[PDB]
């Protein structure tokens, strides 16, 4: 009549998916003999396994997330009663219900164009119409003078993404736009960025 | 007949991977030298698992390998670890007979 | 000389009020027999009661907050020693000190107006002066062509609220502005929005 | 005279809503058949609460309803649950007299 009741079933309270990392909120444990967690991920056709030794932490942040895919995550706890072998087998170890989380896509540009009213006379503001279709919270946009060989990049607008981003005050001359971005997480220190993405072809502003 | 490596707070719970079985010496060791202990371990579903004789030692451990492979495979023909167990032990001799009654957890 | 000392007094470390939900930070518990929390709210003349079974969570997020009111919240813990009845009575159960939290008002528009310098000649930028007086952190503003029957809404400025929000580059023609908004919470997943609010009368931009 | 449903770690703390009182049989049951136990429960402020006779059973439970309604109302004329209690019990018979001394927690 002696037994080691395994730690209760694992639940995943909340999921927040970054570009390359997901911050997952979980429940509390028991059984006096736990070692860590064993998270299984369903890429769609292939599975990966990770371990998180140390339990003082209250949430997990998976990394190395393959871009642009919805993953199914499996939570779990394990004690010394079950070894690494049985952990690989995943029998006797309690497992979580099935939850799938979406990876927010990278900041994507869909249209860049200069435009204003047909100038009658005088100096008029030429607007820049750059259209992005991704998702982030600290998107960055930079321009570079195409004419010269070396042109220290310049960043002009920093803010949330929009179907059409328009800002004036740009010089008339040659300028091509790159796109960047970052995504925040409740864990203060962690901050995930995005790869630079320059438009395939430059555009030129003119009155 | 007590279990070494026992859980704090509640004693009906394990704390280590291998349960350590410790028992105190039977008083009549002196009179009869040729005496051993028959330790047989049962399951959660009242099914015999082990029948092991202990001699020249007043303690026994139940290794992880044993439960996880041998007694999972030979009984359920698969890999597993019976978490809930029952241990009982008594004293016997080559010519001297059994103990008066079973000593169970 | 046997007793079940009730869980110690409940304190509310921090309060963060959303438009329709408040994220409250609390202390830790004891008594080995707790079930959840019993939060009482003082609307000003009427009281409501809520329960939060499960203790693994470390903070609470009340919902269904009546708009535009300062509430007094009461924290509490309860064990199986005290039943639902006594919980309704609130005797023997420890209660928190009295704290009142303010609900941030919805994004309110107070003035919309087009203006520029008296145009002498040429093309000049007509500015849009829209004034909002609410409070949020992800306010959104959209324009719609009043002229036509169907006009897929367009959003032009996304950012923090301001006494006067001014942005150029708008077309001259008919356009009426709606106001939206959201408020963030430390809990990553939760995000609370605001109801759409269109100005009662349209305005027209002109040189 | 021990309390069933007792708290882990520290034994002076309850764990369930209803305290379960378990006691072992008095040795002299065999000699005299007509023997019962007088279990009287006291309060935190040294005030009598219950006087209940237990017979044909060596255990007793203290229901939530009892404390929360009957003994709160008849004594304090209100609704409440005395969290801190004192239990004492002894043996008595119709013709045989009391136990030598009180058995208290």
Curated annotation (Swiss-Prot), chains A, C:
Compartmental location: Virion
Domain of life: Viruses
Residue intervals passing through the bilayer: none
Subunit and partners: Homotrimer. Interacts with baseplate hub protein pb3. Interacts with receptor-binding protein pb5.
Known function: Together with BHP-pb3, forms the central straight fiber, bearing the receptor binding protein RBP-pb5 at its C-terminus. Upon RBP-pb5 binding to the host receptor FhuA, the central fiber reorganizes and undergoes structural rearrangements that lead to its bending, bringing BHP-pb3 close to the host membrane for anchoring.
UniProt protein name: Straight fiber protein pb4
Natural source organism: Escherichia phage T5
Originating gene: D17
Curated annotation (Swiss-Prot), chains B, D:
Location in the cell: Virion
Induction section of the entry: Expressed in the late phase of the viral replicative cycle.
PTM comment: Ubiquitinated by the Bil antiviral defense system when this protein is expressed in E.coli MG1655 strain expressing the Bil system.
Subunit structure as annotated in this protein's UniProt entry: Homotrimer. Forms a pseudo-hexameric ring. Interacts with distal tail protein pb9 and straight fiber protein pb4.
Function in brief: Forms the simplified baseplate, together with the p132 collar protein, the baseplate tube protein p140 and distal tail protein pb9. Closes the tail tube and, upon infection, opens to form a channel thereby anchoring the tube to the outer membrane. These changes allow the tape measure protein pb2 to be expelled and phage DNA to be transferred to the host. Also forms the start of the central straight fiber, which is continued with the straight fiber protein pb4.
UniProt protein name: Baseplate hub protein pb3
Species per Swiss-Prot/TrEMBL record: Escherichia phage T5 (Enterobacteria phage T5)
Residues of the full protein shown: 845 to 949 of 949
């Amino acid at each position: 009549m002696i037994s080691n009741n395994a730690p209760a079933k694992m639940v995943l309270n909340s999921v927040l998916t970054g570009y390359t990392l997901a911050y997952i909120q979980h429940s509390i444990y028991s059984d006096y003999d736990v070692i860590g967690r064993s998270f299984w991920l369903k890429e769609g056709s292939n599975v990966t396994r990770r371990d998180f030794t140390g339990i003082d932490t209250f949430s997990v942040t998976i990394n190395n997330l393959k871009p642009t895919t919805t993953y199914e995550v499996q939570g779990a706890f394990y004690d010394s009663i079950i070894d690494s072998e049985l952990l690989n087998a995943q029998i006797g170890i309690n497992l979580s219900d099935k939850q799938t989380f979406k990876m927010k896509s990278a900041p994507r540009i869909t249209g860049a164009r200069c435009e204003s009213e047909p100038v009658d006379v005088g100096v008029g503001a030429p607007i820049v119409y750059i259209d992005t279709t991704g998702e982030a919270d600290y998107c960055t946009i930079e321009l570079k003078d195409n004419s010269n060989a070396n042109n220290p990049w310049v960043k002009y607008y920093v803010g949330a993404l929009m179907p059409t981003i328009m800002f004036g005050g740009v010089p008339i001359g040659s300028y091509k736009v790159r796109i960047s971005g970052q995504i925040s997480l409740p864990d203060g220190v962690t901050i995930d960025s995005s790869g630079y993405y320059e438009y395939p072809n430059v555009f030129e502003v003119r009155y | 007949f007590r279990v070494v490596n026992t859980a704090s707070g509640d004693v009906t719970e394990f704390v280590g991977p291998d349960v350590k079985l410790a028992w105190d010496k039977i008083p009549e060791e002196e009179i009869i030298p040729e005496i051993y202990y028959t330790l047989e371990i049962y399951d959660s579903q009242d099914r015999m698992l082990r029948s092991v004789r202990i001699e020249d030692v007043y303690t026994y451990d139940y290794l992880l390998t044993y439960n996880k492979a041998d007694f999972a495979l030979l009984n359920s023909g698969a890999l597993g670890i019976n978490r809930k167990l029952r241990f009982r032990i008594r004293a016997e001799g080559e010519n001297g007979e059994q103990s008066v009654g079973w000593a169970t957890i």
